[PDB]
Amino acid sequence: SIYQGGNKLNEDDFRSHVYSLCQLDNVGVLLGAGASVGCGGKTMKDVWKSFKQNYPELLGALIDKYLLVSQIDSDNNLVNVELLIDEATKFLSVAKTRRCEDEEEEFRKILSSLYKEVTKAALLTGEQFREKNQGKKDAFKYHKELISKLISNRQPGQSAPAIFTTNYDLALEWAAEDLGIQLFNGFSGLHTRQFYPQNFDLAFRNVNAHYHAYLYKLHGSLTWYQNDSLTVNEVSASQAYDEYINDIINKDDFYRGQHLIYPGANKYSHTIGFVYGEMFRRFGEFISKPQTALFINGFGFGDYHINRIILGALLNPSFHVVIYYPELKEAITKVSKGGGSEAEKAIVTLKNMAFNQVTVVGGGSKAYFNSFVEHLPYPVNIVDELVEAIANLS
Amino acid sequence: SIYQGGNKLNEDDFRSHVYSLCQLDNVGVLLGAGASVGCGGKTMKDVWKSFKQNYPELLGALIDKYLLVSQIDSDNNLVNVELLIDEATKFLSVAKTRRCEDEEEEFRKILSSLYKEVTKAALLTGEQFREKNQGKKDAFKYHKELISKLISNRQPGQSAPAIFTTNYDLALEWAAEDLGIQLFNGFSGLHTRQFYPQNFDLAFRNVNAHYHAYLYKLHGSLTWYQNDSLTVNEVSASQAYDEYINDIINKDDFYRGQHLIYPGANKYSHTIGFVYGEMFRRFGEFISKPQTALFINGFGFGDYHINRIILGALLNPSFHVVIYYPELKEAITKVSKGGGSEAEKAIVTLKNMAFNQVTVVGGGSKAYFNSFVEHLPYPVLFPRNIVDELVEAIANLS
Amino acid sequence: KRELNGYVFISEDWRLPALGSSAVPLTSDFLNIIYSIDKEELPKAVELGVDSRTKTVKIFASVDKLLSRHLAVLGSTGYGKSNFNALLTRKVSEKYPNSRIV
Ligand SMILES: Nc1ncnc2c1ncn2[C@@H]1O[C@H](COP(=O)(O)OP(=O)(O)OC[C@H]2O[C@H](O)[C@H](O)[C@@H]2O)[C@@H](O)[C@H]1O
Ligand SMILES: Nc1ncnc2c1ncn2[C@@H]1O[C@H](COP(=O)(O)OP(=O)(O)OC[C@H]2O[C@H](O)[C@H](O)[C@@H]2O)[C@@H](O)[C@H]1O
Numbered sequence: 001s002i003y004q005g006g007n008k009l010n011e012d013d014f015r016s017h018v019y020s021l022c023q024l025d026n027v028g029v030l031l032g033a034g035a036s037v038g039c040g041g042k043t044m045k046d047v048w049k050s051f052k053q054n055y056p057e058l059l060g061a062l063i064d065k066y067l068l069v070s071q072i073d074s075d076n077n078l079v080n081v082e083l084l085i086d087e088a089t090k091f092l093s094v095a096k097t098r099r100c101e102d103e104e105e106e107f108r109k110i111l112s113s114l115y116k117e118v119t120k121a122a123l124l125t126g127e128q129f130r131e132k133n134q135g136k137k138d139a140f141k142y143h144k145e146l147i148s149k150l151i152s153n154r155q156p157g158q159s160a161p162a163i164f165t166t167n168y169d170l171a172l173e174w175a176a177e178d179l180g181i182q183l184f185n186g187f188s189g190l191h192t193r194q195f196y197p198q199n200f201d202l203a204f205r206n207v208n209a210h211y212h213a214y215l216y217k218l219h220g221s222l223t224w225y226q227n228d229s230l231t232v233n234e235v236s237a238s239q240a241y242d243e244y245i246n247d248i249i250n251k252d253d254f255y256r257g258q259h260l261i262y263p264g265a266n267k268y269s270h271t272i273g274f275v276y277g278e279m280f281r282r283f284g285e286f287i288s289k290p291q292t293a294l295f296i297n298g299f300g301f302g303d304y305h306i307n308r309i310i311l312g313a314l315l316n317p318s319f320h321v322v323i324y325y326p327e328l329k330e331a332i333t334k335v336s337k338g339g340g341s342e343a344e345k346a347i348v349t350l351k352n353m354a355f356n357q358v359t360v361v362g363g364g365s366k367a368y369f370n371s372f373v374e375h376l377p378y379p380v381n382i383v384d385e386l387v388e389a390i391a392n393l394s
Numbered sequence: 395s396i397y398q399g400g401n402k403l404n405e406d407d408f409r410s411h412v413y414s415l416c417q418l419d420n421v422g423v424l425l426g427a428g429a430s431v432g433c434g435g436k437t438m439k440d441v442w443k444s445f446k447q448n449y450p451e452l453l454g455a456l457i458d459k460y461l462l463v464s465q466i467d468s469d470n471n472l473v474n475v476e477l478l479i480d481e482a483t484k485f486l487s488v489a490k491t492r493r494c495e496d497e498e499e500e501f502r503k504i505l506s507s508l509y510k511e512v513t514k515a516a517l518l519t520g521e522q523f524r525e526k527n528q529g530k531k532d533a534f535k536y537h538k539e540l541i542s543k544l545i546s547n548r549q550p551g552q553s554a555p556a557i558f559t560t561n562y563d564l565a566l567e568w569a570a571e572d573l574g575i576q577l578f579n580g581f582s583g584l585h586t587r588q589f590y591p592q593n594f595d596l597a598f599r600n601v602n603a604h605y606h607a608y609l610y611k612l613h614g615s616l617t618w619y620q621n622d623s624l625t626v627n628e629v630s631a632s633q634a635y636d637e638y639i640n641d642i643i644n645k646d647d648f649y650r651g652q653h654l655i656y657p658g659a660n661k662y663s664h665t666i667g668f669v670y671g672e673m674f675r676r677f678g679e680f681i682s683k684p685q686t687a688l689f690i691n692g693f694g695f696g697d698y699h700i701n702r703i704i705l706g707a708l709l710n711p712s713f714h715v716v717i718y719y720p721e722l723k724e725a726i727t728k729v730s731k732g733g734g735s736e737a738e739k740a741i742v743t744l745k746n747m748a749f750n751q752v753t754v755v756g757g758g759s760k761a762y763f764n765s766f767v768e769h770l771p772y773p774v775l776f777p778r779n780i781v782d783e784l785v786e787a788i789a790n791l792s
Numbered sequence: 793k794r795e796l797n798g799y800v801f802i803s804e805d806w807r808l809p810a811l812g813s814s815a816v817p818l819t820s821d822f823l824n825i826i827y828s829i830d831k832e833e834l835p836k837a838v839e840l841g842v843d844s845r846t847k848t849v850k851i852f853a854s855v856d857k858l859l860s861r862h863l864a865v866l867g868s869t870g871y872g873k874s875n876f877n878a879l880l881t882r883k884v885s886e887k888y889p890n891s892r893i894v
Contacts, residue, residue, distance in 0.1 A: 304791075311788055315781070342792065349787060354780055774794055775816075 001363040005356055019377050021320055022153060025291035028162035029150075034298030035369045036167045039139035042121040045077040051117045058110055066091075078341070080302065082219070085114060085265050089258070093268070112255045115248055118263065122169045122222060130241045135178030142373050143175040149376040151181070151213065160203070162286060163215050166299075168222060168262045170237065172215070181211035186278075193234040197278050218279050220262040230271055232261070280305075287313050297324040297372050301343045320357050323350070324372065328362020395722075395760065397745060398753040411753075413771050415714055416547050419685040422556040423544075428692035429763045430565055433533045436515040438694075439471045445511045452507060455500065460485070472735070474696070476613070476657040479508055483659045506649045512657075513642050516563045516616065524635040528564075529572035536767050537569035543770045545575070545605060554597070556608045558677060560693075562615050562656045564631065570607070577609045580672075587628040591672050612673050614656035624665050626655065674699075681707045691718045691766045695737040714751050717744070718766060722756025799825055820848045829854060838883055859884070 002009040009017075033044060052059045052074065062069045068087065073079050088111060095103040123129045124139075135144070150161045165172060176183045186199050204212055223240050226232055235243070247254045258266045266272045287294060287309070301307060313319055325331070325347055334340040335348045351360050361367045396403040403411075427437055446453060446468065456463045462481060467473050482505055489497035517523045518533075529538075544555040557566065570577050580593045598604055617634050620626055629637070641648050652660045660666050681688065681703070695701065707713055719725075722745075725738035734742070745754050755761055793799065829837065829852065837852035867873055881893045 308788070308791060311784065311791065314784065346791075353783060353787075772794055 001366055002359075002361060003351060004359050005354070006351075015375065018322075018375055021293045021322070022377065024293050024320070026159060026162070026286070026289055027150075027293045027295075028164060028286060029295040029297075030299060031163075031165040031167070031172075031297065032299035033167050034300065036124075036169060036171060036298075038142070038369050039171055040124045041167070041169070041171075044081055045079075047081060047117055047121065048074075048079050049077050051114070054117075055113055058113065061106075062110070081114075081118065082264050085111075085118075085263065086267055088114070089265050090268055093258075108255055109253070112248075112253055115255070115260075119222070119245065119248055122167075124169055124171055129245075130238045133178065135174040135176075140171070140175050140178075142370055143172060144179050146373045146376070147175060147179060147181070147213070149373070149378055151211070152379075153377060161213050163213060164218070164283060165215070166218055168217065168219050170222070176213075181213065183213055183215050185215050185217070187234050195232045195275065200282065216279050216282060218276070218283065219264045220275070222262060224261040224275075225259055226261065226272065227259075232272075232275065284309055287319070288316075290316070290318050292319060294319075294321045295372075296322065297367065297369060301325075301346050304342075307346050314355065314358075317357075322359050322361075324361045324367035326363070326365060326367045328360070329364060331362075395757040396753065396755050399748055399750050400746065403753075408753075408755075409769060409771075412716070412769050415687045415716070416770070418687045418714075420553060420556075420680070420683055421544065421547075421687055422558065422680060423540075423689045423691070424693060425557070425559045425561070426692035426694060427561060428694070429559075430518070430561055430563060432536075432763060433565055434518045435563065438473075438475055441475060441512060441515060442471045442473050445508070448511070449507050452504060455504070475508075475512065476659075479505075479512075479657065479659050480661060482508070484662060487662065502649050503647065506647055509642060509649070509654075513616075513639065516561075518563055518565065523639075524632045527572075529568040534565060534569045534572075536764060537565055538573055540767050540770070541566075541570055541573060541575065541607070543767070543772075545607065546773055546776065547771070554607055556610065556680060558610045558612060560613050562611070562613055564616070566609060574605075576606045578606060579609045579611070581628050589626045589628075589669060594676065610673050610676060612670070612677070613658050614669075616656060618655040618669075619653055620655065620666065621653070626666075626669060678703050681713065682710075684710070684712045686712070687714045687716075689716050689766075691763060695740050701740055708749070708751065716753045717741075717755065718761045719754060719756045720758055720761040722754065723758075798831070799828075800830075801826065801828065820846055823849050827851060838887060855887075 002014055033041065037043060059069075059074070063071055063074065068084065069079060088107070092104065092107040092111065095107060125131075125134060125137075128134070134140075150163075154161060163172070173183065173185075182204070184199055184202065186195060186197065187193050188196055188199055200214060204210065221234075222245070223234050223237070224232060225235075225244070244260070258269060258272075260266075261272060261275070264276065267276060286292070299306075310321070314321075328347070331340070331344050331348050334344050340348075347360075350358060396405075396408050427435065431437065453463075453468070457465060457468065462478060463473060482501060486498065486501040486505065489501065519525075519528060522528070528534075548555070559566070567577065576598075578593060578596065580589055580591060581587050582590055582593060594608065598606060615628075616639070617629050617631065618626060619629070619634075619638070638653075652663055652666070654660075655666060655669065658670060661670065680686075693700075704715070708715075719741055722741070725734060725742055726745075728734040729738055729742045741754070744752060759765075793802070823843075823846065827849070833854050833856070836856070837854050838858060840851045840853050842851065843849050865873055865876065884891050885893065
C-alpha cells in the first residue's frame with residue numbers, strides 16, 4: 001500500500017507525515033487529467049479509442065500515407081493526443097504556404113474531427129455549460145473542500161498556496177467563484193482582457209482593519225484565443241460558447257486556423273508559445289526554492305520534460321515529493337522481466353533508489369482523488385434558514 | 395622514529411599534537427618533487443641516470459672541456475639539474491653576442507637534449523595530456539583529500555591556506571578544478587592572460603545570503619612563456635601542446651631563445667626574474683608572521699637559501715615546523731662517522747638541537763606522501779554515491 | 793570519536809563540551825553507533841528489541857554478560873514476566889542447543 005525506500009507504513013503515521021510536510025514554507029500540488037474523471041471527465045486513451053472507432057476511414061491515412069501513428073500503440077491505445085495535434089497543425093501550414101490544394105483540403109478535415117472529439121469531454125455539464133453558478137452542483141463538493149483546506153492551513157504572514165494543473169477545463173475555476181476568493185491566472189481586465197506576466201507578483205491587504213491563490217495552466221484553456229490582433233484575450237463561458245464552441249460541436253465541418261489555444265497547439269508561432277514558455281519557466285523556478293513540498297496525483301508520467309526536471313531537482317537535500325500511482329502492481333510485474341514502456345521504467349525506478357524523501361503509493365485503488373483530499377488536515381450553513389424568508393416574499 | 399626535542403614520541407600523542415597545530419591563524423605546506431612520484435613522476439636521480447645513459451657522448455664536453463660538471467658528482471648522481479640549465483643558458487647568450495659560431499651551435503644541441511630529457515618526465519599522463527577532465531582519474535585521489543582537509547578545518551573569519559611547491563606539473567590545478575575550488579596564482583584574463591603581483595591580496599564574498607586557496611610556484615610551470623612582448627602569458631594545456639611541447643618531445647633539433655619559463659633558466663633578463671623574485675619574497679614574508687605552522691613533505695633540503703630562511707625564522711617564539719624524512723637512519727649513521735652531505739648534516743643538526751618547536755618524522759615507508767595525508771584529521775560531522783546513480787538515471791532517460 | 797576506519801566508544805565523566813558549541817538533532821546512524829559493541833565479540837550476541845521512539849535501531853546483548861551472573865525480573869502481573877522467560881529460553885536454546893534449561 002505505502003512504500004518509502006522499501007518499508008511499509010500505516011494510516012496514522014502516514015497522516016502524521018502528511019501533516020508534518022504541510023507546514024514548510026512552500027507547498028504546491030500538480031494535477032493531471034486523471035483527477036477530472038471523478039466529476040464527468042474522460043481519459044485520453046478513452047478519447048483515442050472513441051475516435052478511431054468513430055472515424056475508421058481517417059485512421060488508415062494517419063498510419064499508411066503520413067506515418068504519424070505507430071500501429072502497435074494504436075492497438076494498445078498508447079497514442080498521445082497533444083503531440084498528435086501539435087505535429088498535425090504544422091502540416092496544414094506547410095501545405096498552405098506551398099499552395100498544395102489536395103493536401104490542404106485533406107488536412108482541413110482531420111483537425112475538425114479531432115477538435116470535436118477533444119472538446120466534447122471538456123464541457124463537464126453538457127448544454128448547461130452556459131449557465132450561472134455552476135459551482136453549487138454536487139460534483140464540485142470536493143474541490144471547494146480541497147481549496148478551503150489548502151488556504152486555511154497557511155500560517156499568518158506566510159506565502160500563498162500554489163496550484164498546478166494540466167487539464168484545460170473550468171472545473172477548478174468554477175469552485176473559486178462560488179467559494180468567494182480571488183485567483184490570479186495572469187490576466188487582468190473585463191471589457192478587453194489581456195495577458196500580463198508581471199501579474200504573478202501582487203497581493204491584497206486591508207487599509208483599515210487575504211483571499212488569493214495562484215493558478216497555472218500548462219496547456220491553456222477553452223476561453224483563450226488570438227483574434228488576429230496578435231494579442232491574447234480571455235472571455236466568459238457564455239461568450240465563448242456563443243462565439244465558437246457551439247459551432248465546433250454542432251456543425252460537422254467548421255475549422256478556421258491558428259485561432260484557439262488548447263491543448264497546447266500552434267506552438268510554432270512566436271506569439272502563442274510565449275504563454276507556454278512562461279508557464280513552464282514559472283513551474284521550473286518554483287521547485288528550485290528551499291523548503292518546498294510537492295504533491296502529485298493523477299499524472300501518467302508520460303511527459304519526458306516534467307520527469308527530467310523532477311529528477312534533476314532532487315539534488316537539493318531540502319526537497320520533498322509525494323506521488324500516487326494506482327497501477328504499480330502491473331508495473332512491478334512488467335519490470336520483473338526487464339520490459340515495458342518508458343513510463344513503466346520511470347515509475348518503477350523511483351522506488352529502488354536510496355533516498356528517504358521520495359514517497360511512492362501503489363495501493364491499486366487507494367490513491368484516488370477523493371481519498372487524497374480526505375488525507376489533508378482539517379479542523380475538529382448558517383444561511384440555511386433565510387431561504388424560507390426569501391420564499392415568503394416573491 | 396618520531397623525535398621532538400631529542401626524545402621519542404608515540405603515535406597517539408603525535409596525532410593529538412598535529413590536530414592542535416591546525417587551529418592556529420596561519421597554515422601552510424611545502425612540497426617537493428617527491429610528492430608527485432606516486433602519480434607517475436620521477437626524481438632528480440632518475441632524470442640524471444636517464445640523461446647520462448641516453449647521451450653518453452655529450453658528457454665529455456660537459457666534464458672535460460667546459461668544466462660544468464664534476465666527475466665525482468656525476469658518478470654518484472647528485473647533480474643539480476636546474477642550476478646546470480641556468481648556467482648553460484648563459485654560455486649560449488655570450489657566444490651569440492660575441493659572434494662565435496661553433497660555440498653557439500654546440501650549446502643548441504646540449505640544451506635541446508637537456509630540455510627533451512627533462513620535459514618528458516612531467517606530463518604525468520603521456521599523450522592524454524591535452525585532453526579534458528584529467529582530474530577525474532584515480533591517480534589524483536590524495537591531492538583532493540589534502541585540499542579538502544585543509545579547507546574544512548578553518549573557522550569563519552580566519553585566513554585561507556597557502557600552498558608552496560617546487561614542481562612544474564599540473565597536478566594541483568587538475569585536482570582543485572574537479573572539487574570546485576578556485577586557486578589564485580597571480581594571473582587574470584582569458585584571451586590575454588597576464589601577471590599582476592597585486593592579485594595575491596583579494597578574496598571573495600557573497601551578497602545573496604566563496605571558497606578559495608593560494609598557490610605559489612617557486613620554479614615556474616609548463617604553461618608559462620614569453621613571446622616577443624616583454625610580458626608573461628599563460629595558456630591552457632591544449633594550446634601549449636599544440637604550440638611547442640609536441641615539437642620539443644618529437645623532433646631531432648629544435649631550440650629557441652628566451653621563450654620558456656621553467657625551471658628557472660633565463661634569469662639574466664630583468665623581465666623574467668621578476669616572477670621568481672616575487673614568488674620567493676612572498677614565501678619569506680609569510681613565515682615572519684606570529685602564530686604560524688608549516689608542514690614539509692618531499693623536500694630534499696638541497697637548497698641553501700631556503701635552509702637559511704627557515705633557520706632564521708625560528709628566533710620567533712610562535713613558529714612551529716614539522717619535517718618528514720624517509721632516510722633519517724642512514725643520515726644519522728653516515729654523519730656519526732665524520733662523513734655525509736650538506737642535506738644530511740643540516741637535518742642532523744636540526745634533529746640534535748633541543749627545541750619543542752621542531753618535530754622530525756622518519757620511518758622509511760611511513761614518511762611518504764600517502765601516509766602524510768592520513769595524519770590530518772577528518773571532522774566528525776563531515777558527510778560521505780547517490781549522485782552517480784542520479785547521473786546514470788538521467789543519462790539513460792531518453 | 794573517530795578511529796582509523798571505524799569508531800569506538802569510551803566514556804569518562806570528566807570531559808565536558810566547550811562553550812558556544814552548536815546543537816543538532818541526532819540521526820539513527822549515531823544511535824546505532826552508540827549502542828555498538830566491540831568488534832571482537834560481534835557474532836556472540838542475542839537480539840533483544842527495538843526502541844519505540846524511532847523503531848529503526850536493533851539492540852543486542854553479548855552472551856558473556858547475558859548468562860555469567862545471576863538475574864531477577866520485576867514487574868506487574870502478566871507484563872512480560874513468563875513470556876520473557878520462555879522467549880529468552882527459546883532464544884538461548886536456538887543459539888546453542890548445548891544449553892540446559894529446567
Ligand atoms: N478516479 C480517479 N481518481 C484518481 N486517479 C485516477 C482516477 N481515474 C484514473 N486515475 C489515474 O489517473 C492517471 C491517468 O493515467 P493515464 O491514462 O496515463 O492518464 P491520461 O491518459 O488521462 O493522461 C495522463 C497525463 O498525460 C498527459 O501528458 C497529461 O499530463 C495527462 O494528465 C492514472 O494514474 C490513473 O490511475
Ligand atoms: N613517495 C615519496 N614520498 C615522499 N618522499 C619521497 C617519496 N619518494 C621519494 N621521496 C624522497 O623525497 C626526496 C626527493 O628529493 P629530490 O626530488 O631530489 O629533492 P627536491 O624535490 O627538493 O629537488 C628539487 C630541488 O631543487 C631545488 O634546488 C630546490 O631545492 C628543489 O626542492 C628524497 O629524499 C626522496 O627519497
